[PDB]
Design a protein around this motif. Structure first.
Motif, PDB file in Angstrom:
ATOM      1  N   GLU B  54      42.571  44.724  48.136  1.00 47.69           N
ATOM      2  CA  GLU B  54      42.913  43.311  47.962  1.00 47.69           C
ATOM      3  C   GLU B  54      43.054  42.940  46.501  1.00 47.69           C
ATOM      4  OE1 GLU B  54      40.703  40.871  46.595  1.00 47.69           O
ATOM      5  OE2 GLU B  54      41.986  39.043  46.982  1.00 47.69           O
ATOM      6  N   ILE B  55      42.470  43.793  45.693  1.00 51.33           N
ATOM      7  CA  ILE B  55      42.392  43.637  44.230  1.00 51.33           C
ATOM      8  C   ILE B  55      43.766  43.500  43.566  1.00 51.33           C
ATOM      9  CG2 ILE B  55      41.888  45.040  42.166  1.00 51.33           C
ATOM     10  CD1 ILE B  55      39.475  44.105  43.198  1.00 51.33           C
ATOM     11  N   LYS B 102      49.042  39.438  42.781  1.00 48.01           N
ATOM     12  CA  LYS B 102      48.233  39.464  41.570  1.00 48.01           C
ATOM     13  C   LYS B 102      47.633  40.852  41.386  1.00 48.01           C
ATOM     14  CE  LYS B 102      44.115  39.133  43.923  1.00 48.01           C
ATOM     15  NZ  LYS B 102      43.113  38.243  44.596  1.00 48.01           N
ATOM     16  N   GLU B 104      43.795  41.776  39.872  1.00 43.61           N
ATOM     17  CA  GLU B 104      42.566  41.217  39.288  1.00 43.61           C
ATOM     18  C   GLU B 104      42.191  42.029  38.066  1.00 43.61           C
ATOM     19  OE1 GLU B 104      39.618  40.942  42.409  1.00 43.61           O
ATOM     20  OE2 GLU B 104      41.078  40.098  43.844  1.00 43.61           O
TER      21      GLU B 104
HETATM   22 ZN   LIG Z   1      39.744  40.415  45.089  1.00 45.31          ZN
END
Ligand SMILES: [Zn+2]
Ligand SMILES: [Zn+2]
Ligand SMILES: [Zn+2]
Ligand SMILES: [Zn+2]
Ligand SMILES: [Zn+2]
Ligand SMILES: [Zn+2]
Ligand SMILES: [Zn+2]
Ligand SMILES: [Zn+2]
Lengths: 6, 213, 186
Positions: B54-55, B102, B104
């Motif tokens: 998800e990073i 994105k 992170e």
């Molecule tokens: Zn995250």
């Protein structure tokens, strides 16, 4: 974490 | 190549190269990249295995070194400016973020016991980030551990968390993951702020301390 | 704010030629202030004057290693003795030296070349002294600066970086050098 290599 | 270079920071060591790539190059690369795009991956900090996280929610693809005339010129230009030989460079990674995508904050140097191995060219020392489009809202490269944060207008809130760079077509960001003595530079923490309006296309060169192979 | 022409010289050693790195006036400034002080060679302290400070910051920019890591400016007024700038045999301030900037303060008509004998490719043909043909070589041309790496990217010593200076056949070689370490000299 680190982007996966080539 | 020769263009305007704006010193961004010393901690981390960060430089912006103005008009590094021509519009024509930027366009060509996005076009070749489109059909091949898949979900981006990261390496597990402990295991070194490439995984989905998800990073990081861009899509990406890779171009092998020397497989294309246009990119080969760029490749050589990147070796010129970084002053590290082509043997030490990973293949060109092309990326796309839109609609909330994105990356992170993270380090380009590896934590894991595999990926900075001799065979792999050792540790990552420098990254070149080439912006292939100009982004309307968001998608800033943010460096939260920079000595100097951005403020005022035209920067997302995400971007005020650090030193940040607006993606502009043809510009490249160079920054070091390592100190000149080769130790890890934690000041080099960086991410890609959610891309809100616009299609962010970028290309990266991750360059190692030694030859890959 | 210094935008210049870089000519790639070599990959073994990593060497780069920075055309017009210094102005004619900077050169002249340096040599004029060095004169009364020579003993020949001499040293200016970091951030000692405004002219040299501006130059110092330029060097920091092009090498992309910050100022803390740099020695002062050594001005040299010109025995073939090629050597390595790294520390070796048969723990030092700033640790190893990684990058050297050799700034030519005068144009040398004949001879005086900086020579790199352990280099991948040697120069041939004319305009080159005999000494220079022992290696990759560079002409002293006022305002030009040679940049080369004493260490490989992984911080190991690069013996390809062996370098010396050829005798001056016609002219008068003046240079100013900056040595840059991997860590702060503090
Ligand atoms: Zn995250
Ligand atoms: Zn661990
Ligand atoms: Zn990264
Ligand atoms: Zn392996
Ligand atoms: Zn889109
Ligand atoms: Zn020695
Ligand atoms: Zn030397
Ligand atoms: Zn003299």
């Amino acid at each position: 974490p680190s982007p996966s290599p080539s | 190549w020769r263009g305007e270079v704006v010193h961004l920071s010393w901690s981390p060591r960060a430089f912006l190269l103005k008009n590094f790539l021509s519009d024509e190059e930027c366009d060509y690369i996005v076009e070749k990249a489109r059909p091949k795009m898949v979900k981006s991956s990261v390496v597990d900090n402990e295991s070194g295995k490439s995984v989905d996280s998800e990073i990081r929610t861009s899509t990406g693809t890779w171009f092998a070194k020397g497989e294309d005339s246009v990119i080969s010129k760029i490749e050589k230009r990147v070796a010129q400016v970084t002053m590290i030989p082509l043997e030490n460079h990973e293949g060109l990674q092309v990326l796309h973020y839109h609609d909330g995508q994105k990356y992170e904050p993270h380090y380009d140097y590896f934590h894991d016991p595999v990926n900075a191995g001799p065979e792999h060219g050792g540790q990552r020392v420098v990254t070149m980030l080439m912006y292939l489009t100009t982004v309307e809202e968001g998608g800033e490269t943010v460096l939260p551990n920079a000595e100097q944060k951005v403020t005022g207008d035209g920067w997302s809130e995400c971007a005020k968390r650090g030193l940040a760079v607006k993606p502009i077509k043809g510009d490249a960001l160079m920054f070091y993951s390592l100190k000149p003595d080769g130790s890890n530079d934690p000041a080099s923490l960086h991410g890609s702020c959610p891309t809100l309006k616009g299609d962010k296309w970028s290309a990266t060169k991750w360059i190692h301390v030694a030859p890959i192979g």
